């Protein structure tokens, strides 16, 4: 038995690759399509990967796909749509409080991926501001009975947001909050000590956000979702990644970096459950998609744009492709669960590699005349 | 004789350049058109370079040019075409097993670059899957008498592939296998210990592959073909480089990094020996070229695209240009053989240099109005 | 259950310390009393640590304490003494072959730590030279029935030693050999490929050896026993650490670096089971202790000295102190077995720290007038 | 033959160790007993190593052991003694020119290691000053017919020494000179361009020299004999290492660093062929040994001391031990010649390792009461 008593169970497993901390302490601000994940060993099929992920300290979901509360992406409609497929939705606060109240009533007065509560009503969350008049919003939201709320802000480290956190945690102890936006560990600490139940991480790296180009704030997305998640697991706090998502690759490598759920704003935009309706320009069927920092929210500054993106049909045909993509990525990484993927990442077993710009432009399609890219 | 007794034969030879391990342990994921090879000393003509390279542990070839088994590039046709010019071909498994059987019979029932066996029948290989029903494929392929097989897979480190390797190495001892795809040394170890006779290295970096952009797996190609070849020569195992080939430069610097043969998928596509036939779009005579990970192979995910590329005529006028390109590159590097090129690389004598993006965009044509680029 | 689905089982465990490869790739040639091992977490008592370690690929022992074959330390006497307490002994070859034959017969013709074979005769090994006349030694040793032999040499990488290994592995397949001395991975490879069953690592760092000061060869001991053991576990080969042992600390941190057994030459010298008998100088009861490289082995060069060391009584009172020391060190490191200690070392969980000369001179006793140091 | 066509002849040979330039470009001023040489592979016996080394561009010797011209070590006596055993000697210039003239006549008017010229008279060299009156010395030395001269100086980079080199190279073209002392590459260039035929490298690191402690000049010895030899082989110039020699280890690792011959000042002192005669202090038979920078050479400064060292008998019993030591070190390094040792060093095949102070104090004898160290 001498071949066992040298090391014990584990084979040699040569040291090719870079672990997470030697990748994110080189100082360079890497983003999603700037590194990539090296594979490992698989001993299991694609179908049996369990993507059960946690949203906050008491709310777990069957899929990590959550949506961002903008007025051009989610309502009660894609809320009930993602609640039917395991995710969660948040209702934007850019409306009257009574409209958000009857919106959050419409979803809870309403396929094995459950995401519904103890009394089999659907989990659904919402977004609330941080000004003093927003108390009159979320008290009516509690009468409607919302379960998790998002303290949506450009800067997550205000005196106003931590005062609001102290205002709900004494009044509403069962209710849970989502602090953000944070990008660094200092404001992550300054929210977690206030009693935040989960963070939403990432500012500036949105498909709409130009606040890096306008306010010079923020940081690259992947370094943020690594370091805030690395700090947040010290206290047992999940994080939520926003922005910089264009495909099923970015969300997979995003929650492989320590995130538990990922927040999809543009890639869930222009669906059949999205607000408004379709229109046409140059014969392309597309729906407008607009952030709050654009001046079309209602001496002001603008931190966002107004634009549009082509459609992708219903989510009920779209998010099974997303979970199949997460499912295949967590296959060929080599873990049977997302929890095992983060365990292999923080354990140093799962290894990465930095990627240069030429390997980026060869990572996609190249050296051909024309092509049709259909993902499913 | 004192000028000999200081060092002995060798002159000073100043230390300009970087050797391979100081280039590929900086952590950056370099690819083919991101570094380049510094020249040395030549004392010989272009014609007498011997590009004899090994495919697997008993199969050697007169040229290192092998093709990739897709249904849009090779059949028996370019198999007999590359067997006539020293290479090898593999028949794609995206057909019925009887069609692959009569395909591999058509090539062996059939100009000094030989690549034919002891009984002067042509060397020709094929590709086989990894599912349980594929036993009924490769047993008929053995009745047809194929010599080397490729266990084609997206992820080379499965329990299924090593179980298949154990299934052919006890049944068919003379038959030889090609494991893959691997990109790192760990799965290279986990295939070589099973009894793999040669690897095929490189995933995601294909001209069709978007699985880096979709599944977040893989790594850059040049670092993969350096490190898997650096591990594989410990056990005397050749490797085969796939993807990221656009020209005769990439294959030359690819097999200069430790690869013995290189696998050409797109640059051998759209030939007279390619499947289907030509068609026209915008007046350009081009042939469709499609990978298996595209959904046009037959709830599914897609790891490839369907597209097309312009033609290059017959290979019998094309691969002499490729071997002349390899021949001139191995000239001005300074080695009389590919084996001497790898000996100078692992010995530290042959040296490289990293290249930046501005030196990349000046490496090609620049500072002129228009040009005609004809390679031969 | 959200506190489990972030990481899974494992707590935060901050990154204080250095793992083994970042300690032994800084280039500095660290030795035993130049680094030290940081503690971890214990959840078990001192008595239940299992120090079962492997000698070669089929020979496992209950303690890792083996002795070095010099003519001034071991005979049949300390062979039966260490066989009674789980270890192994080797009989020096600096005698006539008939004397080594009746020595190895005396030990096998002869307290729960067993170290005896299938037919309950004591495991005992011996040492054999490498010259051509030594065939007539080890064939008589096989008639006496020795189980493991040590191809004792100053340089383990000779053509003569690998020819000898090929000479016993075809004649005597059940018999097992110990190659050495090696200090680097190249000669470790050049012995393992010949069929060596276990290495003995470390030259020059002995208490007698001045061959570093005379032949300028060798390397520091701890870097050798890390790197040769790191190479040797690729093929499932144990290593044996010689020299530089003054205390129970050095052997503990020595086999914590990848060694399975450790070879004790001077710290087992001057016992009641040691050759010759005691004598007196300045009223101190001490026994002479001499290596083979001294000119007193029988135009010659000398690689050793002749000297003496004070006594320590019987080993049966001494090696229980040694196993209690190993037992307490493997306690406060935090592993229930030596195999778990090497698993935590190669896994990166067990961490080290380099130590400077001032922390060395404060690591021992300091800042007092006089002291009595009694270890048990 | 595929196992040959991957690399060609050379096996894997793992990358354990440090080559010379990564050891001597870390910036630390390493000396002889601060690093050590890792072994390699041997396929040959000890007796057949050929230590033929070159002194200057036309003078080769059978052993690299030369002596330093002080008035307390060499005369005609140890000149004829080392000429009988292959070396060379130099006669100190601290005498009248007629005394040096009849000294150099006594040696040439006078066992297979030859070191004698074309007309079978003994090779013997001498040392000459650099002041203007020294012309009247070396012209009489040329009438006596000396073959190589040493332009002995504390600082080898004077205008006076290069003017002297221009003064002998036009007058005496067959005569050859030894420039020095140099420690850096700049003064090595400024002597080689003048027409120096070989350098003598190393100031301050002598057993007598306190000019580092007094004039703050010089550098550590091993870095000097690496870098001046690395510059000097660009022009095909041998170098001669002085000082810091206490044993046969230092001269072996000294000429392994690029030196061709090594200059022995103290370890050849106090012999039967040394000047003066023996005397006694505390019952130890010892002979006085004094450098020129001491004030006992004849407002002055002193760069040396006057002292004594115990005897070692005749050199004819002593330098066979030295060549046997060089012979065994060049054995277990793994080269059949000194030229092959320098070829393996500059080729990067021969590798080193830095050594710390604790591994230094364990490199010698330790952990014992008392010992007798006899080297032969
Ligand atoms: N990438 C991102 O995540 C990102 C980045 C920028 C903006 N945004 C979007 O822009 C929206 C608006 O951002 P915003 O926070 O700047 O608008 P806001 O109206 O919520 O706050 C405006 C400013 O007033 C301050 N503030 C907050 N509460 C206050 C109070 N009681 N009294 C006085 N001042 C108070 C804040 O510091 C803020 O700078 C957000 O809903 C967010 O969704 C998102
Ligand atoms: N750049 C590249 O080299 C690259 C990358 C990606 C895909 N591809 C191409 O895509 C093709 C298909 O790739 P694929 O391997 O994902 O498709 P596949 O049908 O061969 O395997 C599908 C999945 O099932 C699993 N599998 C394999 N054998 C199984 C078995 N008996 N039972 C259950 N599951 C099994 C595998 O893990 C795999 O994830 C390949 O032929 C390959 O050529 C190439
Ligand atoms: N720290 C250490 O481990 C260490 C270091 C040095 C020496 N030693 C001790 O010194 C002892 C003697 O060492 P040694 O190997 O130098 O003495 P040796 O008599 O075994 O070998 C002497 C030399 O002859 C060569 N040799 C071996 N077999 C030969 C053969 N058939 N024919 C011709 N030459 C042959 C070897 O290369 C060696 O240099 C060893 O038993 C060893 O225990 C130990
Ligand atoms: N480790 C060493 O190698 C080392 C170091 C220091 C000294 N030494 C010994 O000390 C001895 C004396 O050393 P030294 O060179 O300082 O004594 P020196 O008498 O030869 O020279 C004395 C000084 O005068 C200068 N000099 C040389 N030629 C001159 C000339 N024509 N006119 C005017 N000035 C001139 C020199 O620069 C020197 O500083 C040397 O023989 C040498 O062997 C050896
Ligand atoms: O108006 C805006 N200005 C700046 N950032 C915004 C704005 N609206 C939404 N965002 C961010 O963009 C994210 C959506 O991600 P994306 O659309 O997929 O890039 C949200 O979660 C917000 O963090
Ligand atoms: O469908 C696919 N999805 C991803 N990679 C593919 C697919 N088909 C072929 N490949 C890879 O692409 C390589 C062809 O190289 P290229 O076409 O010259 O870039 C093959 O050897 C495969 O490794
Ligand atoms: O004579 C010798 N010269 C050099 N090394 C020796 C000699 N004799 C024994 N050794 C080494 O010293 C080790 C003993 O370790 P130590 O006595 O505890 O320092 C042995 O295992 C040998 O490797
Ligand atoms: O008087 C002196 N002052 C400083 N260095 C000296 C003196 N005399 C000799 N040396 C140097 O010491 C070397 C002798 O080496 P060692 O005696 O073996 O240390 C000579 O080759 C000179 O370079």
Author numbering:
A (entry chain D), B (entry chain A), C (entry chain E), D (entry chain H): 1 to 110, 233 to 420, 437 to 514
From the reporting publication:
The enzyme IMP dehydrogenase (IMPDH) catalyzes the first committed step in guanine nucleotide synthesis. IMPDH forms stable tetramers, each protomer consisting of a catalytic domain and a regulatory Bateman domain. The enzyme converts IMP to xanthosine monophosphate (XMP) and requires NAD+ as a cofactor for a complex multi-stage catalysis requiring rearrangements of active site loops that close around the substrate upon binding, and then must reopen to allow release of product. Finally, we show that filament assembly tunes sensitivity to GTP inhibition by stabilizing a conformation that reduces affinity for GTP.
